[PDB]
Design a protein around this ligand. Structure first.
Ligand SMILES: [Mg+2]
Length: 161
């Protein structure tokens, strides 16, 4: 896939694409609840993913937010402070977003691609938190408010390493 990367002042990369997801990935469907972002991030980090593995991710995001809030430019367009931000995202079944990917990527030192679905299993843009190539990073699929994991087609391990 040919990228046109733009490094943003917000602190991550952006690129338009025109991609049939299944030509490159397998969609690993995550539970259709408000924890789906954390499920899909756990799918990229834990090979033996469990139904509660997303909790491991969500707890790390809260500490990542406390560590990196004052140096993360993406926070500046939220309209919240740290105390109010944590009070929202720590709610059970509350929707995760790209800012939580931002914090987790900083804490775990892993690159995450977020592919935005515009029509059925087709993506029109992608954002990257990190520098690593696509095949050695976590890829997830943004589907309205839902998130799924994307696993490279010719791979045997679901999680990265
Ligand atoms: Mg257990």
């Amino acid at each position: 896939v040919n990228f046109d990367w733009h490094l943003l002042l917000n602190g991550y990369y952006y690129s338009p694409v025109d991609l049939e997801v299944e030509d490159i990935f397998e969609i690993v469907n995550q539970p259709m609840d408000g924890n789906c972002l954390y499920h899909s991030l756990a799918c990229g980090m834990i090979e033996e993913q469990q139904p509660d593995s997303y909790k491991l991710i969500k707890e790390q995001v809260r500490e990542a937010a406390g560590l990196f809030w004052d140096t993360t430019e993406e926070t500046k367009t939220t309209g919240e402070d740290l105390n109010g931000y944590l009070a929202r995202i720590m709610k059970p079944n509350e929707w995760g977003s790209s800012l939580e990917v931002n914090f987790f990527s900083q804490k775990a030192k892993v690159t995450v691609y977020i592919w935005h679905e515009d029509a059925s299993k087709h993506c029109d843009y992608v954002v990257r938190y990190g520098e690593d190539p696509m095949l050695e990073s976590i890829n997830i699929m943004h589907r309205r408010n839902h998130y799924d994991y994307l696993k490279p087609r010719g791979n045997q391990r679901t999680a990265v390493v």
